[PDB]
Amino acid sequence: MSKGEELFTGVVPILVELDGDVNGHKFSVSGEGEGDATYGKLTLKFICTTGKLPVPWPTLVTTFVQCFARYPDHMKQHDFFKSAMPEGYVQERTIFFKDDGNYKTRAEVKFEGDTLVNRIELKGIDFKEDGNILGHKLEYNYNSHNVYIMADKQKNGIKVNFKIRHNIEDGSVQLADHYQQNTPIGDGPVLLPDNHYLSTQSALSKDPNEKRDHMVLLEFVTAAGIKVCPMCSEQFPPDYDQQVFERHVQTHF
Amino acid sequence: MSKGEELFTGVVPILVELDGDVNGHKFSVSGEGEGDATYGKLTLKFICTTGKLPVPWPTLVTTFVQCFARYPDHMKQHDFFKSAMPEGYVQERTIFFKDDGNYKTRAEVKFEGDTLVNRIELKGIDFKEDGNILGHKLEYNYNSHNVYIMADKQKNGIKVNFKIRHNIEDGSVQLADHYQQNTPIGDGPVLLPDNHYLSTQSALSKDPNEKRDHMVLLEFVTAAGIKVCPMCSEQFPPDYDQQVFERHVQTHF
Ligand SMILES: [Zn+2]
Ligand SMILES: [Zn+2]
């Protein structure tokens, strides 16, 4: 459905660079790994190159290449992200931490040679030095979420929203409301989609031989949101021939 | 801290067999992959060898080898699972699905030759044909949970409990309360731990090539629950030198 699409048919190398400033605490993070959009799979490891991260690693999970989403055959028309490639897209976000500060981010994602590269600037303000973020009170894990996408034809792109729950130690949760826009860098045609979502799931781990402050991130990302026997609830592929299916339903009578 | 411990030093291949019966619906699943206790990493793929699974895959996540948990060095005394290897342990569970039925499971985990093998029998009763489980209303994802472990000296074993949240489509959650016991199979000495937890995280995926009904499972499991500048909340290793640490604290004066 786009020239972009064809660029993701194999494993693609990824590089990430973030510059951050949260409540004046400056830091930088570099990441590398690879992505496999046929599977919907990101494999990344990030390292804080300025020392220790002044925020919990899990608050940067969302910031740390949605072009690696698996879009099934029947929805490839709705894949804005690859359709912008190679010239790429800019991702903007504001992220509001309930009862705390906010991050604003701007990312440039595009191919640099054969590598997909995300260069990000992040600013955080109004955080509580004793709150869950600057206080490092967040657990080192993550939950599944759905990323809701819609077209923003006015800006030739998409608008995206979702809410993240970050588990806290005492068993509380810290809410992070994400408001996102993506616009193409280049001026070729892009794919503008019907409303749908990315099911995303995230596993965070540690490289037992890495002494630097670091996060290993696995992500699995599959698009959805664009078949069941009414008698016995048996499940069939959504492509499953309609008359074969009804023949199964008739079996109940 | 045990001989078992040394068996988990490398990548270990894993096989899984389950025989299941839920509300009279019988089924079998076979699984394989590998485990790396040094990272706390399980990699598994499962196939329903009888046809279609009459329950959702995510309801079998907890059932589908806790001997692969990474126990930090300072806690290797509390690692019951490896300590019962190679002879192994039996894991029993009752799993209560709120407003629905329950699974009861019994599993044998041990080495067979060089492979770690888990053979499981599962029985489910009192399920609603219309409810979240037999109606296949559960989303295909997973959240992080902490697995609370305690010694059960009377049984020369451990007792474990945790509560799983399964996301539903409409944004509801289905609760699954797990009550677990593990007892060694052999009669060598085992390690009986102080209370602690395993932080577990799971990512569920599909193999695009595989047309059988199946689940790809990644897990990252690390033990905890057995050091922070009181001024700026800067983080230090739990074993970081106490005088170096206080030297940093004194920096603020
Ligand atoms: Zn039927
Ligand atoms: Zn300090």
Burial of A29 (0-12, 13-18, 19+ CB in 10 A): buried
Nearest CA-CA partner of B219 in A48, A205, A1: A205
Closest by Cα among A188, A192, A119, A180 to A148: A180
CA A205/CA B41 separation, integer angstroms: 9
DSSP for A75-143 reads GGGG-HHHHTTTT-EEEEEEEEETTS-EEEEEEEEEEETTEEEEEEEEEEES--TTSTTTTT-B-S---
C-alpha B253/C-alpha B248 separation (Å) is 10
Pairing of strands A173-184, B196-205: unpaired
- CA B248 to centroid of chain Cα atoms: 39
Query: Of B158, B210, B221, B223, nearest to B32 (Cα)?
Result: B210
List of residues 6+ apart from B244 with CB closer than 8 A: none
Beta bridge partners of A91: A107, A182
Task: Say which experimental method was used.
Answer: X-ray
Chain center to CA of B181: 13
3-state DSSP percent of chain A in helix, strand and coil, to 5 = 15, 45, 40
Residues 6+ away with beta carbon under 8 Å from A25: A54, A55, A134
Q: How far apart are CA B63 and CA A101, in angstroms?
A: 40
Cα gap A233→B136, rounded to integer Å:
7
Cross-strand bridge partners of residue A160 = A149, A180
Paired tokens of A105: 């981010």
Q: How far is the CA of A253 from the centre of ligand 1 (A)?
A: 10
Whether B67 has a binding-site annotation, put simply, is no
Chain-centroid distance, C-alpha A19? 19
Residue of A161, A180, A168 lying closest to A99 (CA atoms): A168
Closest by CA to B182, choosing from B173, B169, B193, B167, is: B193
- Contact list in B for residue A206 (CB cut-off 8 A) is 39, 222
Which whole-number Å values give the CA distances from B182 to B66, B115, B152, B154, in the listed order?
A: 10, 20, 9, 12
Residues bordering ligand 2, an ion, CB closer than 5 Å? B 229, 231-232, 234
Which run of H or E residues covers position A245?
helix A242-250
- The H-or-E segment that residue B245 falls in is helix B242-250
Which residues on chain B place their C-beta less than 8 Å from a C-beta of chain A? 38-41, 52, 70, 129, 134-136, 139-144, 167, 199, 201-208, 218-220, 222, 228, 232-235
* Cα A106 from Cα A91, distance rounded (Å): 6
CB atoms within 10 A of CB B218: 20
Please name each of the domains of chain B with its CATH number. Answer: 1-253 (2.40.155.10)
Closest to B193 in 3D by CA, of B30, B65, B81: B81
Query: Across-strand partners of A164?
Result: A176
Neighbour tally for B45: CB within 10 Å: 18
Strands A12-22 and A115-125: parallel
Are B207 and A38 inside 8 Å of each other by CB? no
Q: In chain B, whose CA is at the least distance from the CA of A218? A: B203
Distance between CA A95 and CA A160 in Å, rounded? Answer: 12
Q: Report the C-alpha gap between B217 and B31 in whole angstroms.
A: 10
Distance (Å) of CA A154 to CA A85, A189, A191, B180? 20, 14, 13, 55
Residues of A in contact with B228 (CB under 8 A): 136
CB-based burial of residue B244 (10 Å sphere; 0-12 exposed, 13-18 middle, 19+ buried)? exposed
Residue B232 DSSP label: T
Q: Which of chain A's residues have a Cβ under 8 Å away from the Cβ of B141?
A: 144, 199, 201
> Are B203 and B216 spatial neighbours (Cβ–Cβ below 8 Å)?
no
**Nearest-by-CA chain A residue for B36:** A208
Which residue matches tokens 């402050």? A213
Q: Taking Cα atoms as reference points, which of A127, A33, A119 lies closest to residue B233? A: A127
Compute φ and ψ for A207, nearest 5 degrees. -85, 110
DSSP state of A234: -
**Strand B214-224 to strand B41-48: parallel, antiparallel, or no bridges (unpaired)?**
antiparallel
B250 alpha carbon, closest ligand: 2
Name A230's Cβ contacts closer than 8 Å, sequence gap at least 6.
A249
DSSP output for B74-127? GGGGG-HHHHTTTT-EEEEEEEEETTS-EEEEEEEEEEETTEEEEEEEEEEES-
CA distance B87 to B249: 49
Mark yes or no for CB contact B201/A203 under 8 Å: yes
B224, B216 Cβ separation under 8 angstroms:
no
Which residue out of B233, B234, B252 would a mutagenesis test of the A interface target, given it has the greatest number of A Cβ atoms within 10 Å?
B233
How far apart are the C-alpha atoms of A133 and A136, rounded to whole Å? Answer: 5
Q: Which residue has the tokens 């030759």?
A: B113
Best CA proximity match to B14, nearest among B121, B122, B120, B118: B118
- Helix, strand and coil content of chain B, in percent to the nearest 5, comes to 15, 45, 40
* 3-class secondary-structure state, position B228: strand
Give how far Cα A78 sits from Cα of A2, A5, A158, A237, B73, Å.
Answer: 10, 11, 10, 20, 48
Q: Distance between CA atoms of A216 and B196, rounded to whole angstroms?
A: 24
Q: Is the dihedral of CA B127, B132, B136, B139 positive or negative?
A: negative
Task: State the amino acid at position A167 in one-letter form.
Answer: N
Span from the CA of A26 to the centroid of ligand 2 (angstroms)? 16
Round to whole Å and give the CA distance between A244 and A83. Answer: 36
Query: Do residues A40 and A205 touch, judged by C-beta distance below 8 A?
Result: no
For residues B82 and B7, the answer to whether their CB atoms sit within 8 Å is yes
Please answer whether residues A2 and A79 qualify as being in contact, where contact means their C-beta atoms are separated by less than 8 angstroms.
yes
Sign of CA dihedral B216, B46, B60, B180: negative
With 0-12 CB in 10 A as exposed, 13-18 as middle and 19+ as buried, what is B50?
Answer: middle
Q: What does the alpha-carbon distance between residue B106 and residue B147 come to, in Å, rounded to a whole number?
A: 18
Q: Is B148 exposed, middle or buried (0-12, 13-18, 19+ CB in 10 A)?
A: middle
Q: Please name the residues in contact with B179: beta carbons below 8 A apart, sequence gap of 6 or more.
A: B93, B94, B95, B96, B160, B161
**CA–CA gap between residue B111 and residue B113 (Å, rounded):** 6
Tokens of B40: 């706390």
| Of the candidates A88, A24, A22, A34, the residue with the CA atom closest to the CA atom of residue A60 | A22
What backbone phi and psi angles, to 5 degrees, belong to B243?
-75, -35
- Classify strands B196-205 and B41-48 as parallel, antiparallel or unpaired: unpaired
Contacts for A242 with CB less than 8 Å, ≥ 6 apart: none
Chain A residue numbers with beta carbons less than 8 Å from the beta carbon of B39 are 205-208
